[PDB]
Design a protein around this nucleic acid. Structure first.
Ligand SMILES: [Mg+2]
Ligand SMILES: [Mg+2]
Ligand SMILES: [Mg+2]
Ligand SMILES: [Mg+2]
Ligand SMILES: [Mg+2]
Ligand SMILES: [Mg+2]
Ligand SMILES: [Mg+2]
Ligand SMILES: [Mg+2]
Ligand SMILES: [Mg+2]
Ligand SMILES: [Mg+2]
Ligand SMILES: [Mg+2]
Ligand SMILES: [Mg+2]
Ligand SMILES: [Mg+2]
Ligand SMILES: [Mg+2]
Ligand SMILES: [Mg+2]
Ligand SMILES: [Mg+2]
Ligand SMILES: [Mg+2]
Ligand SMILES: [Mg+2]
Ligand SMILES: [Mg+2]
Lengths: 138, 87, 59, 110, 224, 107, 101, 44
RNA sequence: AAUCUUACCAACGUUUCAGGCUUUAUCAGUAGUAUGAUUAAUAUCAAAAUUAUAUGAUUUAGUACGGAAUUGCAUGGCUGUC
RNA sequence: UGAAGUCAAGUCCCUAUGGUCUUUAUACGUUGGGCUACACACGUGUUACAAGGGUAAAUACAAAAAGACGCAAAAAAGUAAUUUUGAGCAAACCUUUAAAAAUUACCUUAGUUCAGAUUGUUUUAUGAAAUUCUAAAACAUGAAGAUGAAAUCGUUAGUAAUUG
């Protein structure tokens, strides 16, 4: 079952301009460079490794024209290897958007191609492109 | 009533062929004056021109004038002959 | 879009005297406010509806 | 000239002068004695006060645009430092080795 | 003093509330928009004997609506302008038949009674030509007048046959004949070959009723 | 008729695509744009673009997969069939009519 | 010539094959036509080509392979009305049963 | 030789082509385009 | 029941098999298409670009022509009702 | 879930088939039109003639069913229909679904803040295409109707009726 959606009256309408809340953009600063990042992982000598969890499905029904049913490749990624700051975390919660994310892990899905291999490597190209753009913050 | 304005008005393959033949200066004639696809809107270039419109097993005639622009061809023509209960 | 062609009371004169939750301004002073919801049904009211600081409220 | 006429070929909106003449007309129909309507408009009588027509609906032209948008690229890169400049060149050059993009392109040419 | 707008006349004794039922086009939503502009309530009067209210009353209240116009008259023109060009919707407003594809074999009764705009707009036109003759006779004419104009255009092969028969005896006999307008008001006709297989009805050119009523050999039949 | 009335509200009807100033972008705006390159999202105004018709799914071949079965007509799907008996009855009944047709033509 | 079924199946066949191949063409043209942010001309020139095509292979309507009857069809099975009443006698339908709620 | 992929990006914006555009009757019957110039010029 | 459907009316057009098999003759810079022109439309014509993919495209003869045309008072089949 | 068989009940026009007829036309393809006509009248069914009603505002509880030539959350815009956008799911996992009622307040028995036809004009959605011949929203139009003659129908408890 599902309860019905209702639009509650959270905020009252007419509240003075001085008494409202406004919050600056904390992501406004000088972005990091590259060697600043590589200097963090000196224990590993320029080598990072990520722990992940790969879901995948198969069907007996994926055939002549429903052969596209086997294209999704769902993944999770663990974060405790990522020494995430307060500012790096919020940046990461924005790139994913309105997507699942916890302190421990977050999801990553691709259904862009027919063959799952091509949808699997693309996840790796996303995980890289998200770790760098995330650790570009301090 | 009509469509929304942004849904642009319909002019079929045929009348687009005729508008070009106007543009060349090729006059309208026996077959070129003929019209089908009544839902096609009544363009603006073809003022001062006769067009024999089709219904059923014969035709209707009209001339275009600036007031007639914008409308549809089939809104000037009658298909079903009116019904009158006899005495 | 929230007001929709109405007048707020922080522009109305008489509410200005009392709208401001300014009790600190009064030497030897104190302020008390409340929230009536009889005309409303299941209306969750609190200091999140009004952007309002913590601590200065009592459920 | 052919495509625009799915825009310019448009319903006619009436002026206030035309409607005071719609009443004082005599003929019921128009195609019969068409010229008399052109005559019945031409009568000028400024004794009446000044006139204001209604505003026609929000029509829109041929070259016009409904809502303009800020232009952006496909892939917005912060290249001010310029780090992503290297991540791209190998990326694209890798794709061509596996799945080229050198196609006959019967339609567009560059 | 007075002020006119939308065909309604204002004075300094009026009550802008009770204009609601009277004016044609301004029921509820607009007055709310209007009282927002006056920054006053429904209960207060927007009009007073002082000139400040009066000029303020007119300056605001003119922005909504263009002066020297109406909505009622604009409505009828947009109806007559359709029949004025010999359109499909032009007939169905005149006869009393539906416009929106609504059916007829059972139920079109609310159209026949309520929709009375194009009808009254033609009676006044007939008086401008054929004088102050009583109405039910005038009804016989412009009904009979439009019909031949239809058959002339749409069914042109039939009009010519009605025209040919008239012109044969015209040259030969020089005798009299007649016109059955009272038959043509109801839509009855004569004068061609059917698939089923002296008076004439249909062969005329338009405006003929002017040619005969208002100039011996020809005699009109209006009533019966 | 066309009743128009003034809208005392002003300004462009706001949108994400319209809040953006590409010359002066915030941090929260570069971040969303950095998501769009990754996953291919779209940013557009309140008005209609064609992406809803580029993202749709339209599989007409799935009907052809029924027409290509040829269960209904074996000869179209498996031409080696030759219904011998049904042809025999079709030939006998014809020839016997032609006996009747000629013998009735005389009679 | 061909009997009614084997003919009409082909008509409703050629109507789909046309659509299958002019799919990408008619999706892009129709994409531009609904793109409000663009000028009206390019929105119209696409509308001009979008109509400059065989409409005859677009007037598709369903049909039953067996009976040749078009109006009532079961999409769950892909066959008709007069036939399912027959196969149900023979029980040829797989896994089906009579609803007793 | 053939070009690489990188070298073509250098010639990305170099638009050498002459008079490329949406057209009608051009490569088939350019005579009518000339008539189309005459008629609308005659109306001026 | 907007077109198709849909059998009906009007008009333009077609004259005998979709696939497979057999067979007669010609063409191969020809053939085809998300191409182009042409007609109201099917049709018909064709080289600006593009596709070239094994054993072609077109044509004659043959391989159960066809039929919402009629008789439910010749029948099946399916079904209502008592 | 429903015997034997009757009503020469109905259908050859879903498909099959005997007899009969047609075969350059009673066959075939396409374009447009038509099946939607309108004097009178019948059967069926929805909505109403009001205050155990109408409306505004704030705001609860369901089942069954369906989903990729799909369902489409969250946020945002619009007056509203609806649109931008497409996280997530081929699934008891994600998604599409309530109203009446109840609470507070107004309207105060008036052809009316009832009723809601019909018509004009923009806007909204699908489509190649809405004029003939679609559905919906808003501004505005705001007709009949004031619980129905003689006669006649349904129902037997989670039934009538009401609500979606
Ligand atoms: Mg209280
Ligand atoms: Mg309509
Ligand atoms: Mg959408
Ligand atoms: Mg359909
Ligand atoms: Mg039809
Ligand atoms: Mg047809
Ligand atoms: Mg037939
Ligand atoms: Mg019988
Ligand atoms: Mg019978
Ligand atoms: Mg019917
Ligand atoms: Mg009620
Ligand atoms: Mg609310
Ligand atoms: Mg939810
Ligand atoms: Mg939502
Ligand atoms: Mg997704
Ligand atoms: Mg209630
Ligand atoms: Mg009344
Ligand atoms: Mg009401
Ligand atoms: Mg009463």
């Amino acid at each position: 079952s599902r309860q019905a959606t209702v639009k509650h009256l959270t905020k009252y309408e007419a509240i003075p301009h001085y008494m409202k809340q406004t919050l600056r953009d904390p992501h406004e600063y000088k972005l990091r460079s590259m060697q600043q990042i590589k200097d963090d992982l000196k224990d590993t000598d320029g080598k990072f490794v990520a722990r992940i969890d790969i879901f995948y499905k198969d069907y007996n029904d994926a055939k002549f024209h429903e052969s596209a049913m086997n294209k999704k490749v769902k993944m999770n990624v663990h974060l405790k290897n990522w020494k995430l700051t307060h500012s790096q975390k919020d940046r990461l919660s924005l790139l994913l958007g309105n997507r699942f994310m916890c302190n421990d892990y977050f999801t990553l899905i691709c259904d862009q191609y027919t063959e799952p291999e091509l949808n699997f490597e693309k996840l790796v190209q996303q995980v890289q492109e998200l770790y760098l753009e995330c650790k570009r913050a301090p | 009533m009509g469509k929304s304005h942004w849904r642009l008005k319909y002019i079929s393959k045929s009348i687009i062929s005729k508008i070009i033949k106007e543009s060349i200066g090729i006059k309208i004639k026996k077959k070129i004056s003929v019209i089908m696809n009544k839902s096609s809107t009544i363009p603006s270039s073809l003022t001062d021109n006769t067009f024999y419109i089709h219904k059923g097993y014969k035709f209707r005639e009209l001339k275009i004038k600036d007031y007639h622009v914008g409308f549809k061809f089939g809104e000037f023509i009658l298909t079903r002959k009116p019904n009158i209960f006899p005495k | 879009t929230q007001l929709r062609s109405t007048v707020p009371p922080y522009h109305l004169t008489v509410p200005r005297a009392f709208l401001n939750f300014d009790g600190h301004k009064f030497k030897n002073g104190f302020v008390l406010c409340a929230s009536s919801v009889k005309n409303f049904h299941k209306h969750i009211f609190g200091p999140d509806s009004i952007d309002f600081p913590l601590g200065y409220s009592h459920e | 000239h052919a495509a625009s006429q799915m825009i310019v070929s448009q319903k006619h909106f009436l002026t206030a002068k035309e409607e005071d003449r719609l009443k004082t007309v005599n003929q019921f129909y128009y195609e019969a004695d068409t010229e008399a309507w052109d005559i019945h408009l031409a009568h000028e009588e400024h004794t009446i006060e000044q006139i204001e027509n209604f505003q026609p609906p929000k029509r829109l032209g041929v070259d016009d645009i409904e809502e303009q948008l800020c232009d952006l690229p496909l892939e917005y890169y912060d290249n001010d430092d310029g780090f992503w400049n290297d991540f791209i060149k190998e990326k694209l050059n890798r794709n061509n080795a596996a799945y080229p993009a050198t196609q006959g392109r019967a339609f567009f040419k560059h | 003093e007075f002020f006119q707008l939308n065909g309604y006349i204002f004075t300094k004794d009026t009550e802008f509330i009770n204009t609601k039922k009277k004016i044609f086009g301004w029921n509820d939503y607009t007055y709310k928009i209007i009282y927002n502009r006056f920054e006053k309530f429904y209960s207060e009067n927007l009009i007073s004997y002082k000139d400040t209210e009066w000029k303020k009353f007119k300056s605001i209240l003119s922005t909504f609506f263009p002066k020297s116009r109406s909505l009622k008259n604009r409505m009828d023109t947009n109806i007559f302008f359709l029949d004025f060009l010999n359109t499909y919707r032009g007939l169905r407003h005149s006869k009393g038949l539906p416009v929106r594809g609504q059916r007829t074999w059972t139920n079109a009764w609310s159209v026949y009674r309520s929709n009375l705009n194009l009808r009254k707009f033609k009676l006044e036109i007939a008086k401008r030509i054929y004088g102050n003759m009583p109405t039910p006779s005038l009804t016989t004419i412009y009904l009979a007048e439009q019909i031949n104009y239809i058959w002339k255009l749409q069914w042109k092969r039939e009009w010519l046959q009605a025209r040919s028969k008239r012109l044969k005896l015209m040259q030969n006999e020089h005798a009299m004949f007649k016109i059955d307008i009272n038959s043509m008001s109801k839509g009855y006709i004569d004068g061609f070959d059917k698939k089923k297989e002296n008076t004439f009805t249909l062969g005329f050119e338009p405006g003929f009723t002017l040619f005969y009523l208002r100039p011996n050999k020809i005699k009109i039949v209006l009533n019966e | 008729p066309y009743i128009k009335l003034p809208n005392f509200k002003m300004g462009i009807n706001p949108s994400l695509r319209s809040k953006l100033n590409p010359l002066a972008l915030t941090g929260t705006q570069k971040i969303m744009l950095a998501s769009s390159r990754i996953f291919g999202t779209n940013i557009s105004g309140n008005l209609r673009s064609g992406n809803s018709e580029l993202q749709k799914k339209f599989s007409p071949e799935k009907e052809l997969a029924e027409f290509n079965t040829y269960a209904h007509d074996l000869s179209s799907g498996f031409p080696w069939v030759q219904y011998y008996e049904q042809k025999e009855r079709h030939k006998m009944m014809i020839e016997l009519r032609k006996m009747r047709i000629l013998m009735r033509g005389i009679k | 010539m061909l009997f009614k079924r084997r003919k009409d199946i082909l008509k409703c066949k050629y109507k789909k094959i046309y659509i299958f191949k002019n799919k990408i063409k008619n999706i892009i043209l129709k994409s531009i036509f609904f793109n409000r942010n663009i000028k009206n001309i390019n929105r119209a020139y696409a509308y001009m080509i979008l109509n400059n095509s065989k409409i005859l292979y677009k007037k598709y309507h369903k049909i039953c392979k067996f009976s040749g009857y078009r109006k009532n069809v079961n999409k769950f099975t892909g066959i008709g009305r007069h036939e399912l009443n027959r196969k149900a006698t023979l029980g040829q339908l797989q896994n089906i049963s009579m609803n007793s709620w | 030789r053939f070009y690489t992929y990188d070298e073509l990006i250098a010639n990305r914006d170099n638009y050498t082509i002459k008079d490329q555009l949406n057209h009608k009757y051009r490569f088939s019957n350019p005579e009518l385009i000339e008539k189309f110039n005459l008629v609308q010029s005659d109306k001026d």
